[PDB]
Design a protein around this motif. Structure first.
Motif, PDB file in Angstrom:
ATOM      1  N   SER A 618      -5.368  -3.755   5.128  1.00  7.98           N
ATOM      2  CA  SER A 618      -5.210  -2.898   6.023  1.00  7.98           C
ATOM      3  C   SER A 618      -3.972  -1.903   5.947  1.00  7.98           C
ATOM      4  N   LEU A 619      -4.081  -0.798   6.434  1.00  6.81           N
ATOM      5  CA  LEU A 619      -2.902   0.243   6.339  1.00  6.81           C
ATOM      6  C   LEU A 619      -2.569   0.872   7.730  1.00  6.81           C
ATOM      7  N   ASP A 620      -1.349   1.068   7.937  1.00  4.64           N
ATOM      8  CA  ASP A 620      -0.791   1.820   9.074  1.00  4.64           C
ATOM      9  C   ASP A 620      -0.343   3.249   8.624  1.00  4.64           C
ATOM     10  N   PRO A 621      -1.374   4.120   8.900  1.00  3.97           N
ATOM     11  CA  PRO A 621      -1.095   5.570   8.586  1.00  3.97           C
ATOM     12  C   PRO A 621       0.221   6.395   8.789  1.00  3.97           C
ATOM     13  N   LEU A 622       0.724   6.005  10.080  1.00  2.00           N
ATOM     14  CA  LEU A 622       2.052   6.439  10.360  1.00  2.00           C
ATOM     15  C   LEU A 622       3.310   5.701   9.976  1.00  2.00           C
ATOM     16  N   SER A 623       2.946   4.421  10.091  1.00  2.00           N
ATOM     17  CA  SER A 623       4.062   3.230   9.846  1.00  2.00           C
ATOM     18  C   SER A 623       4.238   3.201   8.131  1.00  2.00           C
ATOM     19  N   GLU A 624       3.140   3.301   7.428  1.00  2.00           N
ATOM     20  CA  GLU A 624       2.973   3.303   6.063  1.00  2.00           C
ATOM     21  C   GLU A 624       3.238   1.883   5.721  1.00  2.00           C
ATOM     22  N   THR A 625       2.702   0.921   6.342  1.00  2.00           N
ATOM     23  CA  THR A 625       2.878  -0.286   6.044  1.00  2.00           C
ATOM     24  C   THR A 625       1.521  -1.038   5.553  1.00  2.00           C
ATOM     25  N   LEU A 626       1.525  -2.084   4.753  1.00  2.00           N
ATOM     26  CA  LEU A 626       0.206  -2.359   4.169  1.00  2.00           C
ATOM     27  C   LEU A 626       0.322  -4.195   4.681  1.00  2.00           C
ATOM     28  N   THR A 627      -0.832  -4.484   5.364  1.00  2.00           N
ATOM     29  CA  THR A 627      -0.774  -5.726   5.670  1.00  2.00           C
ATOM     30  C   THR A 627      -2.363  -6.333   4.984  1.00  2.00           C
ATOM     31  N   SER A 628      -2.337  -7.699   4.412  1.00  2.00           N
ATOM     32  CA  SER A 628      -3.400  -8.283   3.733  1.00  2.00           C
ATOM     33  C   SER A 628      -4.335  -9.107   4.930  1.00  2.00           C
TER      34      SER A 628
END
Length: 680
Positions: A618-628
């Motif tokens: 999953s990706l957070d479009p404004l935070s630019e973080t990737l979580t698995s």
């Protein structure tokens, strides 16, 4: 005829061990691929540019194989030949080179190369010699054929005589440029003897030991010895072509491959010890060869010059690239040396594998099996009211039927809707099925039958009437494109395999399409099988991954955009472009779990195989973080999971339904189904 009778006799024997073998599949490529290729890549051509045949001497029949097994086996002939080339080009022109084929079987390679009639192997005509080694029984038959087949005897110097017969039936043959030597490779000591009987110890002679899928059936210890025994021959190359299981024996493709060979009672054993590419390096270093150049089939594919790929793509209709990716990653080409003089020029060098990144586990959502045996791939599906509708796809054949899916926490119910009209959309896959008309109708766009039969006929299905209506038709045919209903009730259309605009907009009420390719250099190329969703809330949408029409490149970009409904020349504009290796997916599907979290699912990649940690993220479009979002070891190992041809449906829960792959003639697999729920 005495000779002809002998020829046929052992000709049949050769067959009892040729079909569903690598030789049979090479005959396939020899029939289809080699005639359609230009000098550089046909391996076999006379002075007048007439293709020459060799594999026909052991497998005469017209053999045929899927477009995936064929490209693979072209890569496989090109694997050996590119490596042999690098050695022949660099080694001083007066040195004697010896190619020793370990477990050659009926491989006609020597004759392809020794034949002065073949001007595509002229660099082999003079100073190259060949030793064929396999089990005694097998070499007997193979020598019968070499003697009784004039075209073959002609090559290596034996007499061509309709009126001469050699009834000895021995397991060995000796000529200036070709010898066959019997040997059970599982007997390290008989082999080491053989090395010397053949005078391979001579440092003035360059050795090329070739192991093409042979030391792969042998136990690690039994094969490691063969490798090591040769390392003690001064000035030697070792070329090994065999399987890998880069992510363990439970990777979707890996699972099927091992199991297939088990059935054929020819398990893959060595691969168990040597899973990955790097695993092969340390192995060859440890066993004598200190200089190693190694990569998988897909690095070999990228390695082809663009003039070559263009020809290949045009050989036969092809559209199973997720299968091609997997297969490629499960086959390694490893070039080893025990002398440092020989350099792997940049022409042949394989770039080292870039390290993988570890990702933070997602604290909110998890995976939990949810059987949805719709038993079909590459249809599409959208929600209408509270109902779900799946259309078309293959299973394994292309269908036109519509399925209503009653989604339930534990399982999914399926009823075949009945069509009420006399006209219906032809059976298709790789189309798009999208909801329109305030949830009253479903829009069928594009799609294909066979890969050369792209479609241009769109349709609309009305739930009430249960009728199919052919609406307007696309100017250009189009499949493997992406789609998503926009806020206003219209339908965006992304790339695909087409000659048409990179991005279309279909006005439902106005019943027309509109080229809305953004003014960005990114959209210069039609993006194939990317992920594409839009969120009405955050007033934006994403484009994820996707491949290009060269069937080689794959975008690693996540594209954020907006939709200006009141604008009729630039409705779509790019907000931002994000980059990351785990975005580089082909045949994935994305979806918004929340306005601030985009579920990226499945697909294949040119870089490597996806594992339990990164098949779903999953990706957070404004935070630019990737979580698995990890898949449990259970679901990985025990259930059938193959993320290709699948779809996403939502009714705080997103189901992963449909999907499969034929895994390169190692049997088929079906994605059973999964669901992504909130975490308690």
């Amino acid at each position: 005829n005495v000779k002809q009778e002998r020829r046929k006799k052992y000709a049949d024997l050769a067959i009892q061990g040729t079909n569903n073998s690598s030789i049979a599949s090479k005959r396939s490529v020899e029939l289809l691929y080699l005639p359609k290729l230009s000098s550089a890549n046909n391996f076999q051509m006379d002075k007048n540019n007439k293709l020459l045949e060799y594999f026909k001497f052991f497998v005469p029949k017209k053999i045929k194989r899927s477009p995936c097994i064929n490209r693979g086996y072209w890569l496989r002939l090109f694997a050996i030949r590119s490596r042999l080339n690098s050695i022949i080009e660099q080694t001083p022109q007066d040195k004697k080179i010896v190619v020793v084929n370990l477990g050659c079987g009926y491989d006609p390679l020597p004759f392809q190369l020794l034949d002065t009639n073949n001007i595509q192997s002229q660099q082999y005509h003079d100073r190259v010699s060949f030793i064929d080694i396999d089990y005694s029984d097998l070499l007997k038959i193979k020598i019968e054929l070499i003697k009784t087949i004039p075209e073959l005897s002609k090559i290596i110097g034996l007499s061509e005589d309709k009126d001469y017969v050699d009834d000895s039936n021995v397991d060995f043959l000796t000529t200036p440029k070709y010898l066959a030597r019997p040997c059970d490779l599982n007997d390290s000591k008989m082999f080491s003897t053989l090395l010397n009987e053949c005078q391979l110890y001579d440092p003035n002679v360059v050795k090329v030991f070739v192991a093409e899928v042979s030391l792969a059936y042998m136990k690690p210890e039994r094969s490691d010895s063969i490798i090591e025994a040769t390392s003690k021959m001064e000035n030697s190359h070792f070329i090994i072509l065999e399987q890998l299981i880069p992510k363990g024996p439970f990777e979707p493709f890996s699972k099927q491959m091992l199991a297939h060979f088990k059935r054929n009672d020819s398990p893959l054993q060595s691969v168990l010890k040597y899973n990955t590419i790097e695993s092969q390096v340390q192995r060859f270093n440890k066993l004598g060869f200190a200089y190693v150049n190694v990569g998988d089939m897909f690095q070999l594919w990228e390695s082809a010059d663009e003039a070559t790929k263009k020809e290949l793509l045009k050989v036969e209709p092809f559209d199973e690239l997720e299968e091609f990716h997997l297969f490629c990653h499960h086959y390694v080409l490893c070039h080893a040396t025990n002398y440092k003089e020989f350099a792997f020029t940049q022409g042949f060098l394989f770039d080292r594998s870039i390290s993988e990144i570890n990702l933070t586990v997602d604290e909110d959502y998890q995976l939990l099996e949810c059987e949805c045996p719709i038993n079909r791939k590459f249809g599409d599906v959208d929600v209408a009211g509270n109902d779900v509708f799946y259309m078309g796809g293959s299973n394994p054949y292309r269908v036109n039927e519509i399925l209503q899916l009653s989604i339930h926490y534990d399982k999914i119910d399926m009823k075949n809707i009945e069509v009420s009209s006399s006209e219906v959309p032809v059976a298709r896959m790789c189309h798009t099925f999208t909801t329109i008309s305030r949830n009253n109708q479903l829009l069928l766009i594009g799609g294909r039958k066979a890969p050369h039969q792209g479609l241009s006929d769109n349709w609309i299905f009305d739930m009430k009437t249960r009728e199919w209506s052919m609406i307007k038709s696309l100017s250009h045919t189009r499949f493997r494109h992406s789609a998503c209903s926009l806020p206003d009730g219209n339908v965006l259309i992304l790339g695909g395999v087409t000659e048409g605009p990179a991005m279309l907009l279909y006005n439902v009420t106005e019943e027309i399409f509109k080229d809305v390719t953004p003014k960005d250099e990114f959209f210069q190329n039609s993006l194939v099988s990317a992920g594409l969703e839009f969120d009405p809330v955050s007033k934006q949408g994403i484009i994820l991954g996707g491949g290009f029409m060269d069937q080689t490149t794959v975008s690693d970009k996540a594209i954020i955009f907006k939709y200006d409904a009141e604008n009729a020349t630039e409705p779509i504009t790019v907000i931002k472009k994000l980059q990351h290796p785990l975005f580089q997916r082909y045949g994935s599907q994305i979806k918004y779990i929340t306005p601030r979290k985009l579920l990226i699912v499945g697909g294949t990649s040119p870089s490597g195989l996806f594992d339990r940690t990164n098949s779903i993220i999953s990706l957070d479009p404004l935070s630019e973080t990737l979580t698995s979002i990890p898949i449990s070891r259970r679901i990985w190992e025990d259930h059938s999971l193959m993320l290709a041809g699948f779809s996403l449906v939502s009714t705080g829960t997103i189901h992963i339904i449909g999907g499969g792959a034929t895994c390169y003639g190692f049997g088929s697999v079906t994605n059973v189904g999964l669901k992504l729920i909130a975490i308690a």
